[PDB]
Design a protein around this ligand. Structure first.
Ligand code: 4C8
Ligand code: 4C8
Length: 1182
């Protein structure tokens, strides 16, 4: 919404840039004007053949006499025109170069200037400006918004004035040479803009319906795949498939209805567009029989108008490129024009010599850019004597750290003044101020150069002698020399990561070359290992005594030798003096001392599509007819102008022109009829395989075992996404692109035959010319992409050192040296600049070449069409035909290169979708094999079970686990932590077979037992019961599948679960909807319902996995009261974390490290004193 003044945007265009644009826009206008003139001459050549075409047939008497005056007219005329076109092509060769070259030159020259000014502006902003902005958005604003500016002031402007030239020069020749047809062509324009407006309304309203249609099926998939362990537990795998299959049926019917309506839309749209033209051209014919126009002029205005009319559309993208470049230039120029109060690039203020370093802060009130929300300094008074070293202590607020900020004049105070020597800090140069202040901060930062270079960021003029003394004077010399490459080592975020106390000494050496008169030491010893701290601390003490120093730290070790110590309380200075004095004061300082002491030929995807042997053959056959039908319009056009250039006697003409225009419209309606079919047929054929794919995939997905859904690679969202995309992508490959790619190869095929068999070696010429300009148009775009990738590679090297500069900013400004990064970024940009110069000559040559090879190609089209062909006995009417036939058949093949990614994007989406069906599990619920025992009673026999989870085969959970529980008993299961408690329930449910050992139920190993039958006698109840969106009676009836459960039977379960209080309390009762879609209710209810569906099954084994986990107060007492009634009549395994409710259990088992450690009845384990009695004691007390 915000934008820029048009002149301010080119403020950096001066002298030549202003000329380049003027000459560029000039030749651009010349380039545009060139095309409608090309059409104007195409009318005069018709007139030439038309006068001879009328007189040659008018003879029917003399033959040799027509070999004289006729050919003489032709050779003076045709050579005059051919001489004229050859000139036009040389014109576009020059102006198209001038057009694109100059604008890309002015763009490159300016964008170089933008970048430099704009990075200069970034480094010039005071710190308070950064505290309110994100540096990351800023740097991306650097590389992206400048790119958008380049796109707008580039060669697009030349294309714009080229297009307006075609537009203006279009209707000028349109109006002057024939004003009537223009108004007639504009009259059908609202119809063409109204038919394409029905597309913006149909597409935008139906693309939502499908995204709503599958969102009903994709919602089924998401509550299933999220609750997958519950559907697997109760074996609703046939229902949840069925229940997704039923939503796929509706998505199919809505998909065929969309295929019917959308194909009715296209066909009617084209048939209105084509009829609109043909009426404007038939009524072109009505004006030649009346002698208001020449047969040549009708063409001249008809093309020049339609050329200029479509030239409007070909200019619209360049407008939006200019405006976006303006809007992008706003926030950029806003940074360049913005002037600071502090600078640091300013050459102003005093530069005191013989600085002695007496510092005082007077009544400083300050607040960071958070402003009125917080005020961190409520007045202040502090002097530090020259040579002395003052230490600042504080409990919190870190108002300590603020004084180092103000002493650098990173910000100015709200009220008060900071004074170095006698002068206010605001009178001294900002740069000289920071050159007389050395700074060592908590986190040290080192730039990605050599050690000597990071030290060289202290001062630019320095010799390895002074680097050596500096590092040796910060005892950092002994420790780099051992490191290889000597001073020539590397540092940075990337490469040679060092010890913290080692990085700080390089920072101390960096600040030491600064020979500062003032020293600021903020938190430097803090957050550092204890032993290297003393190594650094020796350097800090060796860095002082030549300087006045303010130091801030939480290490009270460094503070004793400070000449004065100062404590803060709420930004107010409270205590000051020597260490001993503050201790006698017994205040804040004393109080803090005591405290601290694979693309491949996949045919099988088409073999599954072979479910419909018809529906394709209908579309293909119907597409090829549409293909062969489409040049016949060019054949009609060729003979509407043909017979009427070849007229002779004029009485018969008016009667035929009505006949062709009729045929045309019969040929368009038979084109409508065939194009509805080829769309509907593929549409239906695509939507039905969409179901089969999503059915078989969702079937095969319910076939894998829990081992697969635990994979971090496969989550519920990633599976629904994999489910939707892959099915839609393969639909597109077999859908429109294939009907179109066969319609078009039939288009060119039925066109090339007509052209080849009519014109001899005429067609053989055009088949030498057209492929070359097509290839030359491709190699242009390859070179285009190559230059694009290359410039991206070498401007990111600049933006990379810009990245380093700006997100490490507060350090660089503390060291000054902005002019360093300033110069480095300039040297970095100098390569893309001198590269951007070559870009202009390259784009100009290529574009001018492809334009010239289009104009020269058509000079050869007529000079060969006449002369050697028309001095013979071949006819203009065919040359017209071969043009439209070949040229349209070629531009119809241009759709093949556009639908190419729809094939690859589908094959890749196919690549996964064939794998996902064929993958078979270790434990398949679908296998009908298994024992299905007859005897009812249930044991559980864990024996030597070692188990590790397939996702994390690192820490074992179960290793040598052995349990046995009789029928009708409760097996209490206590654990130190982890799923060692829970893995038992997962292995009995056979979510996994154990690594070693075995688990048995009735004496039979479950591993050889039937998988589905096994789970059918299991009453699993988890800690968070997931309930699908449906009737609570149906969430309950979900406990027994393969059979519909009686109402009184699901009532019996709700009676058991003690949930029947709601189930009548609701207005709907058992038919109320739950799942946080129809109704919401708390967890105690959800849980009871899960108990209800558990015991609908009438299991022989309950499995209670921390059922009271998320629950509170009386809700626990009632759910436990339901669980305690559910057991005592069944085999039970309970791992609930309430050991008070576990006292009345028949056997308690303690799990240690996957081994069973300690077991027995409650009082038995309570008589023993160990883990279980440590467990019961810790909760009962707490
Ligand atoms: Br009559 C008549 C026939 C074709 C005309 O131009 C074409 C041409 Br040439 C090809 C196709 Br496909 C559709 C149309 Br409309 C015109 Br304008 C008038
Ligand atoms: Br786009 C384009 C369309 C026709 C052009 O010249 C003609 C013209 Br004018 C008439 C016929 Br028939 C074929 C061609 Br090719 C040119 Br040059 C460019």
């Amino acid at each position: 919404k915000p934008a820029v003044s048009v002149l301010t945007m080119f403020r950096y265009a001066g002298w030549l840039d202003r000329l380049y644009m003027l000459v560029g826009t000039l030749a651009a206008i010349i380039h545009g004007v060139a095309l409608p003139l090309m059409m104007l001459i195409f009318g005069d050549m018709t007139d030439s053949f038309a006068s001879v075409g009328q007189v040659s047939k008018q003879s029917t008497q003399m033959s040799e006499a027509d070999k004289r005056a006729m050919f003489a007219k032709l050779e003076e005329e045709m050579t005059t025109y051919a001489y004229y076109y050859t000139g036009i092509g040389a014109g576009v060769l020059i102006v198209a170069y001038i057009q694109v070259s100059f604008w890309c030159l002015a763009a490159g020259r300016q964008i170089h200037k933008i970048r430099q000014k704009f990075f200069h502006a970034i480094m010039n902003q005071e710190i308070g400006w950064f505290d309110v902005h994100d540096v990351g958005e800023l740097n991306t604003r650097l590389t992206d918004d400048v790119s958008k500016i380049n796109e707008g002031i580039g060669d697009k402007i030349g294309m714009f004035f080229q297009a307006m030239a075609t537009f203006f020069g279009g209707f000028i020749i349109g109006f002057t040479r024939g004003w009537k047809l223009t108004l007639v062509i504009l009259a059908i324009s609202p119809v063409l803009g109204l038919s394409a407006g029905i597309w913006a309304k149909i597409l935008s309203s139906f693309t939502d319906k499908e995204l709503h249609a599958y969102a009903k099926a994709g919602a089924v998939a998401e509550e299933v795949l999220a609750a997958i362990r519950t559907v697997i537990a109760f074996g609703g795998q046939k229902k949840e498939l069925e229940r997704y299959n039923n939503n796929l049926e509706e998505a199919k019917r809505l998909g065929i209805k969309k295929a019917i309506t959308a194909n009715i839309s296209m066909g009617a749209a084209f048939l209105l567009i084509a009829a609109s033209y043909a009426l404007a051209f038939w009524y072109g014919t009505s004006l030649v029989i009346s002698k208001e126009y020449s047969i040549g002029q009708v063409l001249t205005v008809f093309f020049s108008v339609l050329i200029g009319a479509f030239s409007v559309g070909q200019a619209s993208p360049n407008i939006e490129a200019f405006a976006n470049a303006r809007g992008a230039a706003y926030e950029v120029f806003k940074i360049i024009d913005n002037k600071p109060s502090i600078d640091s690039f300013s050459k102003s203020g005093h530069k005191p010599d013989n600085i002695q370093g007496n510092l005082e802060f007077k009544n400083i009130h300050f607040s960071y850019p958070s402003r009125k929300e917080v005020q961190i300094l409520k007045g202040l008074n502090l002097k530090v004597k020259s040579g002395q070293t003052v230490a600042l202590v504080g409990n919190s607020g870190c108002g300590k750290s603020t004084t180092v900020q103000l002493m650098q004049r990173l910000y100015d105070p709200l009220d008060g003044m900071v004074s170095i020597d006698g002068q206010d800090i605001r009178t001294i140069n900002v740069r000289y101020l920071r050159e007389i202040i050395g700074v060592v901060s908590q986190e040290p930062v080192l730039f990605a150069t050599t050690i000597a270079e990071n030290i060289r960021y202290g001062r630019e003029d320095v010799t390895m002698d002074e680097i050596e003394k500096a590092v040796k004077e910060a005892n950092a010399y002994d420790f780099i020399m051992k490191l290889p490459h000597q001073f020539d080592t590397l540092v940075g975020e990337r490469g040679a990561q060092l010890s913290g106390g080692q990085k700080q000494r390089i920072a101390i050496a960096r600040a030491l070359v600064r020979n500062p008169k003032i020293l600021l030491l903020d938190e430097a010893t803090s957050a550092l290992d204890t032993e290297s701290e003393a190594v650094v601390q020796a350097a800090l003490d060796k860095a002082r005594e030549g300087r006045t120093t303010i130091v801030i730290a939480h290490r009270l070790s460094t503070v004793r030798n400070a000449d004065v110590i100062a404590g803060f309380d709420g930004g107010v200075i409270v205590e000051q003096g020597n260490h001993d004095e503050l201790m006698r004061e017994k205040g804040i300082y004393f109080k803090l001392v005591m405290t601290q002491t694979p693309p491949a030929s996949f045919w099988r995807i088409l073999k599954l599509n072979s479910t419909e042997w018809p529906y394709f053959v209908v579309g293909i056959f119907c597409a090829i007819i549409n293909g062969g039908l489409q040049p016949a319009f060019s054949v009609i056009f060729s003979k509407v102008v043909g017979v009427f250039t070849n007229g002779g006697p004029p009485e018969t003409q008016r009667q035929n022109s009505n006949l062709f225009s009729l045929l045309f419209l019969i040929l368009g309606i038979i084109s409508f009829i065939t194009f509805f079919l080829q769309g509907f047929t593929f549409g239906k054929a695509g939507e039905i395989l969409t179901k089969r794919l999503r059915y078989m995939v969702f079937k095969s997905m319910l076939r894998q075992d829990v081992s697969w859904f635990d994979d971090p690679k496969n989550t519920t969202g990633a599976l629904t996404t994999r489910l939707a995309n892959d099915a839609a992508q393969v639909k597109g490959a077999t859908g429109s692109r294939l009907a179109v790619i066969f319609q078009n190869i039939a288009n060119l095929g039925t066109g090339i035959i007509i052209s080849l068999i009519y014109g001899w070696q005429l067609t053989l010429l055009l088949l030498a010319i057209v492929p070359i300009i097509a290839i030359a148009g491709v190699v242009e775009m390859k070179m285009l992409s190559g230059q694009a990738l290359k410039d991206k590679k070498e401007l990111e090297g600049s933006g990379k050192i810009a990245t380093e500069a700006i997100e490490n900013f507060r350090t660089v400004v503390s060291l000054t040296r902005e002019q360093k990064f300033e110069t480095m970024y300039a040297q970095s940009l100098q390569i893309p600049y001198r590269n951007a110069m070559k870009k202009a000559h390259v784009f100009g040559i290529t574009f001018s070449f492809t334009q010239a090879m289009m104009y020269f190609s058509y000079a050869a089209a007529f000079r060969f069409g006449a002369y050697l062909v028309t001095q013979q006995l071949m006819t203009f009417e065919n040359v017209l035909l071969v043009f439209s036939a070949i040229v349209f058949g070629a531009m119809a093949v241009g759709q093949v290169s556009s639908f190419a990614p729809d094939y690859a994007k589908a094959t890749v989406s196919a690549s996964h979708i064939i794998r996902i069906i064929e993958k078979t599990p270790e434990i398949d619920s679908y296998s009908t094999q298994g024992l299905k025992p007859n005897m009812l009673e249930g044991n559980v026999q864990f024996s030597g079970v070692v188990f590790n989870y397939p996702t994390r085969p690192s820490i074992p959970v179960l290793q040598g686990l052995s349990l046995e529980v009789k029928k009708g008993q409760t097996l209490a299961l206590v654990g130190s932590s982890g799923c060692g408690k829970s893995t038992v329930v997962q292995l009995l449910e056979r979510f996994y077979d154990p690594m070693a050992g075995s688990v048995f139920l009735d004496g039979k190993e479950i591993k050889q037992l039937n998988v589905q039958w096994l789970r059918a006698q299991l009453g699993i109840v988890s800690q968070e019961p997931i309930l699908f969106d449906c009737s609570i009676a149906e969430n309950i009836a979900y406990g027994d599948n393969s059979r519909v459960v009686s109402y009184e039977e699901i009532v019996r379960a709700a009676k058991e679960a003690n949930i029947h209080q709601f189930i009548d309390s609701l207005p709907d009762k058992y038919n109320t909807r739950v799942g946080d879609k129809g109704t919401q209710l708390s967890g105690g209810q959800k849980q009871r319902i899960a108990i209800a569906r558990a015991l609908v099954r009438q299991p022989h084994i309950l499995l209670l996995d921390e059922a009271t986990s998320a629950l509170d107060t009386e809700s626990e007492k009632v759910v436990q009261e339901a669980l305690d009634k559910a057991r005592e009549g069944r085999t039970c395994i309970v791992i609930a974390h309430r050991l008070s409710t576990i006292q009345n259990a028949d056997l308690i088992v303690v799990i240690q490290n996957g081994k069973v450690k300690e077991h027995g009845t409650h009082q038995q384990l309570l008589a023993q004193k160990g883990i279980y009695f440590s467990m019961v004691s810790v909760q009962a007390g707490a």
